[PDB]
């Protein structure tokens, strides 16, 4: 049912289908895409940030921000507030930026531990993880550090449940840890994968939640019951990125084998596969959803 | 002197270009550890190595247009179980002193009974059983096959569709 | 079933339990569409066993017999749900549930035979791909096959190891990514492969030694198996290889029984008169009832293997060594010893040679000096004890001395030589 219509829309949008080849001078680390219309931004190794607008489907350039001292490690658009973003870099500082006035709102010296950054879904606080297990909670409006936690084993990716009550993280044993955010206490730990989990991501629907391990298995779980619904045995290498469609029905995963796989949530089968020259490292969607942005080992749009 | 005692030898009469699909059908049925496949030239060797690697078979090619130290280095890597399949035009004699090789395909016809003896007969220490299959394409392959049957006094019949596992595997 | 078992899952009933057991008996293996109630049955069983009535447990064995088959049918999402099955399982009844996978869980459904044929096909495919260059992309593939169908794949790879001559190290590098619950399945498949009625057995024993020294499998079932075959040969050699896996001047760098016999009814008199000398005299049935344990078992295993080799070259010693297995929570001590784990550690001209070799780093030299000083003090104490024993103390006596000396010589290591000299 949804598979045939998805394949038809895939063929139609692929016939409608850009490629910003080497927009930055160096290795692009991440891309993020929010702001329910079309506003993109990307960060790279060459301490640059780039902000794009998407009109009628050819990419144009809005902004190119400097001021960093090291490579951009993680980029993320704000979900709830009007259009703002926060950049993470290895120059011991985090930078909250303004889109409208094209300036840095706050350059906060945290530590050189700045690796991966995210928001609680209220948009009030920013969580930042590291290599040394110290996760720092900094208020986005107060611009002041609020909390410092330590998992003491391993951390790769942290995330926030949609109720702004549960806080999820991973480790090197394939476990997932679940904490209560107003309690700041470790609530539950699930020993699930044998190898470590790299990337996790929620859905806009709040129904499911996928964890991608290094055993080439994307395990899709339920949010409320916290039970393991299904998995996706389509890849042959550890999964680099995970991303969800805004209808909650499809998902995209990429790994070392150059194969961007778009599978269905409700069915559990692959709907589309596309390949390119280099391993795709990040995949992003947008709420209107005919399109798929992705950046690889260069920002490319794909009509799906 | 090399002997053929304890070996099973068979032949298949088929076309030349259909030997790849038939060989793949044999690779889908016959359980093997390491397989040496004998070809006649360099370009056929490189093309067969390309066909095996692109079909995800781990194979290494040694042809006669190579330096001696590179042949010895690839033979030493083949000793250490780095790739299963060896596409070899020729060897340095001494039988087959690696016990891991069990099934040997003559994709192309050898020169005489002596080259067939150097391709098929083994000089191992503990592994004395093995399987050898020679591809027959024309009448000349059958003539050299009957020549080998006259020289070495062995029975070489048609390759069946069911092969016992304990007859040639120790 | 979701409606009926709301409050028990909201916590984490014998008529209710029997009705739910009848519903799962009438369902069968078709829980492939619903992992949620599968996880709920797992959590209910885990809470019941944490609170832990043999009838409820036998019906739980029956529902595990009925619920392993959905995990067999799921060719997706078994890397994680096997850990819920292990949380259920955390003894010999687990091995009986694994023995249900022989012919009972199979050949009763067409789809399971289809899954069996597909996993034999993919197993043969990936066994035709394993090299030593295949440094774990293939471990991912064999793990993906082993999450869903562990028993068929383990039987197939053990047939490959038995028939194809030491393919062992790519197999263990592939099984690096194997789950927690599949380890006991692999152990039971080892036990079932040992039931086959000699180089293949040596290769299988070396494979068992490598896998057991690599992983926490808690191999008490192998200990029960080797004890049962001692009560009924080469299994003793396999157990000696497993114990070596888990843990002339060089031999001379490393007795009390003869001195006690110098100072039957004489055994009772020595028991009335008077540490490791008890096991040393035990090396010499019910009449005999009147980390050195690993070495004590290893010496008896070496004597039994020497007797087996002398028998094979051309059975009284098998009765004593089984008693050494009978005198042996030993599996919990063996796993702690494997988790904890050379010639200089044992340790006098040999002590001076060891200190000179450690001299030609200061912490090890100080430790060796402390060990040598303690050895000199204990040697002075043993010389004082020997002087006290000397202060304490025809042809038939010489014949009795020869009979006591010959049995200690042929029944032990070269340490009988030093005792004979003394």
Description:
Chain A starts with a helix and ends with a strand. Chain A has 304 residues and is mostly beta strands. Helix content of chain A is 4%, strand content 51%. Chain A has one helix and 28 strands. Chain B has helices at residues 19-29, 42-54, 68-79, 113-120, 139-152, and strands at residues 7-13, 34-38, 59-62, 85-88, 101-106, 130-136, 157-158. Chain B has one domain. A seven-stranded parallel beta sheet of chain B has the order 3-4-2-5-6-1-7, with helices on both faces. With 170 residues, chain B is α/β, with parallel strands linked by helices. Chain C has 25 helices and no strands. Chain C has helices at 6-11, 14-27, 35-51, 54-73, 81-89, 92-99, 110-127, 138-148, 150-163, 168-174, 181-193, 199-214, 220-231, 234-246, 249-252, 256-262, 265-273, 276-283, 292-313, 318-327, 330-340, 349-359, 362-392, 395-410, 415-421. The interface between A and C is medium-sized, with 22 and 19 residues.
Total count of strands of chain B: 7
Which oligomerization state do the chains in this entry correspond to? part of a larger assembly
Number of helices of chain B: 5
Chain pair forming the biggest interface = A-C, 22 and 19 residues
**Structure classification of chain B:** alpha/beta
H/E topology pattern of chain C: HHHHHHHHHHHHHHHHHHHHHHHHH
Which structural class fits the helix and strand makeup of chain C?
mainly alpha
Q: What is the count of distinct domains of chain B?
A: 1
Overall spatial form of chain B: globular
Number of helical elements of chain C? 25
- End-to-end distance of chain C, in Å? 79 Å
Rg of chain B is: 15 Å
Question: Main β-sheet of chain B: number of strands, strand sense, barrel status?
Answer: 7 strands, parallel
Share of β-strand residues of chain C: under 5%
Number of strands of chain C: 0
């Amino acid at each position: 049912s949804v598979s045939s219509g998805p394949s038809r829309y895939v063929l139609g949008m692929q016939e409608l289908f850009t490629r910003e080849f080497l927009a930055h001078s160096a290795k692009v680390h991440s891309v993020a895409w929010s702001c329910d219309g079309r506003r993109l931004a990307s960060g790279s190794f060459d301490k640059t940030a780039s902000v794009f607008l998407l009109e009628k489907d050819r990419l144009v350039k809005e902004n190119n921000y400097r001021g960093h001292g090291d490579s951009v490690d993680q980029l993320c658009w704000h979900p709830s507030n009007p259009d703002l973003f926060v950049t993470a870099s290895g120059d011991k500082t985090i930078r909250i930026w303004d889109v409208r006035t094209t300036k840095c709102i706050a350059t906060v010296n945290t530590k050189g531990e700045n690796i991966n950054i995210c928001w609680s879904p209220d948009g009030q606080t920013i969580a930042v993880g590291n290599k040394d297990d110290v996760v720092t909670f900094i208020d986005a409006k107060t611009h002041r550090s609020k909390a410092e936690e330590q998992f003491k084993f391993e951390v790769n990716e942290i995330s926030w449940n949609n109720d702004n009550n549960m806080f999820f993280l991973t480790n090197g044993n394939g476990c997932i840890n679940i904490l209560s955010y107003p309690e700041l206490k470790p609530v539950q730990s699930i020993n699930a994968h044998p190898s470590n989990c790299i990337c996790i991501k929620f859905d806009p629907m709040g129904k499911y939640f996928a964890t991608g391990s290094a055993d080439a298995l994307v395990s899709l779980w339920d949010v409320d019951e916290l039970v393991c619904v299904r998995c996706f045995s389509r890849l042959d290498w550890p999964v680099r990125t995970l991303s969800f469609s805004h209808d909650g029905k499809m998902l995209a995963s990429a790994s070392e084998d150059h194969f961007i796989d778009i599978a269905e949530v409700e069915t559990g089968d692959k709907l589309w596969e596309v390949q390119c020259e280099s391993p795709t490292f990040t995949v992003a969607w947008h709420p209107k959803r005919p399109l798929l942005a992705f950046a690889c080992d260069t920002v490319k749009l794909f009509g799906l | 002197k090399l002997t053929l005692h304890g070996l099973q030898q068979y032949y298949v009469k088929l076309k030349d270009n259909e030997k790849n699909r038939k060989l793949f059908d044999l690779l889908d049925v016959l359980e093997f550890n390491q397989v040496v496949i004998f070809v006649k030239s360099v370009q056929r060797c490189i093309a067969l190595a390309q066909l095996l690697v692109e079909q995800n078979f781990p194979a290494i090619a040694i042809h006669r247009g190579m330096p001696q130290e590179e042949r010895l280095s690839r033979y030493q890597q083949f000793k250490d179980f780095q790739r299963r399949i060896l596409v070899a035009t020729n060897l340095f004699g001494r039988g087959m002193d690696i016990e891991r090789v069990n099934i040997a395909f003559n994709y192309d016809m050898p020169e005489d009974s002596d080259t067939y003896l150097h391709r098929v007969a083994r000089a191992g220490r503990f592994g004395t059983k093995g399987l050898a299959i020679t591809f027959v394409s024309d009448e000349n392959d059958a003539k050299i096959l009957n020549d080998v049957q006259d020289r070495f006094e062995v029975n070489i019949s048609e390759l069946p569709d069911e092969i016992d596992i304990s007859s040639y595997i120790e | 079933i979701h409606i009926t078992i709301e409050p028990l899952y909201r916590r984490v009933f014998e008529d209710l339990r029997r009705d739910v057991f009848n519903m799962f008996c009438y369902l069968g293996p078709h829980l492939s569409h619903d992992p949620i109630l599968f996880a709920k049955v797992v959590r209910i069983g885990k809470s019941f066993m944490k609170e832990f009535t043999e009838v409820i447990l036998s019906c739980l064995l029956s529902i595990t017999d009925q619920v392993l088959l959905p995990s067999l049918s799921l060719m997706d999402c078994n890397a994680c749900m096997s850990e819920e099955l292990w949380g259920m399982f955390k003894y010999q009844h687990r091995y009986r549930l694994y023995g249900q996978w022989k012919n009972e869980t199979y050949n009763s459904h067409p789809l399971l035979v289809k899954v069996k044929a597909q996993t034999i096909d993919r197993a043969k495919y990936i066994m035709k791909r394993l090299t030593k260059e295949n440094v774990k992309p293939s471990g991912r593939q064999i793990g993906k096959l082993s999450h869903s169908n562990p028993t068929i794949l383990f039987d197939y790879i053990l047939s490959q190891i038995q028939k194809y001559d030491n393919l062992i190290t790519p197999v263990v590098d592939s099984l690096k990514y194997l789950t927690s619950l599949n380890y006991d399945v692999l152990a039971y498949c080892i036990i079932e492969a040992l039931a086959n009625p000699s180089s293949w057995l040596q290769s299988l024993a070396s494979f068992c030694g490598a896998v057991f020294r690599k992983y926490p499998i808690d191999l008490a079932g192998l200990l029960q198996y080797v004890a049962n075959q001692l009560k009924a040969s080469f299994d003793l050699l396999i157990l000696k290889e497993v114990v070596q896996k888990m843990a002339t001047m060089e031999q001379l760098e490393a007795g009390e029984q003869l001195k006690a016999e110098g100072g039957k009814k004489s055994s009772q008199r020595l028991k009335d008169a008077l540490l490791p000398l008890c096991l040393l005299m035990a090396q010499q049935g019910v009449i005999f009832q009147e980390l050195k344990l690993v070495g004590k078992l290893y010496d008896q295993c070496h004597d039994t293997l020497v007797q087996f080799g002398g028998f094979l070259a051309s059975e009284m010693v098998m009765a004593p060594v089984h008693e050494a297995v009978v005198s042996l929570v030993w599996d919990d001590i063996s796993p702690q010893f494997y988790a904890t784990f050379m010639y200089d550690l044992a340790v006098h001209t040999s002590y001076e040679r060891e200190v000179n070799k450690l001299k030609v780093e200061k912490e090890r030299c100080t430790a060796l000096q402390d060990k040598l000083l303690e050895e000199e003090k204990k040697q002075m104490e043993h010389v004082q004890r020997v002087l006290q024993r000397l202060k304490l103390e025809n042809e038939t006596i010489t014949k009795f001395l020869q009979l006591c000396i010959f049995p200690r010589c042929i029944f032990s290591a070269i340490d009988a030589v030093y005792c004979a000299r003394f």
